[PDB]
Every structure is written in C-alpha cells, then in structure tokens.
Structure 1
Amino acid sequence: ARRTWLGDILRPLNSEYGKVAPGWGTTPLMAVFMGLFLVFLLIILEIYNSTLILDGVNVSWKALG
C-alpha cells in the first residue's frame, strides 16, 4: 500500500485492532456509570414533565426573566 508522511505519523493510532482486555475488564464500572446516567435522565425528564418539582425551578418561559 502507499506510505505517506501523515500516514506514518498517524500509524500508531490504528495499530491495535483486535486487542482486548481479558474477561469482563472494566464492565462493572461501566455499569455504575450507566445507572447513574439513567437516574440523571429521569430527573431531567421528570423536571421537564412537572412530575419532579424542585424549589426555585420555574419550568416556564417566565424563567427567562
């Protein structure tokens, strides 16, 4: 194939195709961040929906001023 100056430089960034951590690796930690993120989206959704009503948070155009 054709070699180029920019290619030779970017080369190491496309060189570990296939490589994996063993077994489950970091999968438990990923799971924690997912769960946190769902709760967080829940709160955002239920705020917008006026199902969760927080103090000082006026979900209306009247919060623009």
Structure 2
Amino acid sequence: PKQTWWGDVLKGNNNSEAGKFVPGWGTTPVMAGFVVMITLLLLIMLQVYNHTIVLDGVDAGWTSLGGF
C-alpha cells in the first residue's frame, strides 16, 4: 500500500463515494426523457439517411458534395 503522491491526488475520485447511491428513483425519471429524445434523434437521422424523410433542399446523395 504505497502512499504515492499521485494516489493522494486521485484517491478522492477513486473511492471517496464508493458504494453510495440515493434511495428511490432519483433522477431516473429525467433520464427517461433524454432517452426518448435521442430515440427520436437517431430515428430521424436513419430516415434521412434512408430517404424516407426528405428534408427541403437536402439531397441525401453524392450530389450534396457540391461546394468543395
């Protein structure tokens, strides 16, 4: 159990609050919303990549490279 200097610096981040949790649900409800949000985001991207969704003036193909 060497008491190095860097260990002194980092031990608080390592295991100061090890094994601690808040009871109940806590922030879990909020997390739910975030997941749903990204579940739309990714979905939209997929369809945009899939050409299911066609955004206005956004030609999902090699033609969009025009301008470089």
Scaled to the shorter chain, the TM-score interval is over 0.9
Count of aligned residue pairs for this structure pair: 65
| Paired AA for residue 40 in structure 1 | L
1:41-60 equivalences under 5 Å are: 41-60=42-61
2:7 equivalent to 1:7: yes
TM-score normalised by the chain length of structure 2: 0.91
The CA RMSD over aligned residues, in Å, is 0.7
* Alignment gaps of 5+ in structure 1: none
TM-score normalised by the chain length of structure 1: 0.95
* Correspondence for 2:27: 26
- Of 29-38 and 12-21, deviating more is 12-21
Q: Structure 1 stretches (4+) deviating beyond 3 angstroms?
A: none
* Alignment gaps of 5+ in structure 2: none
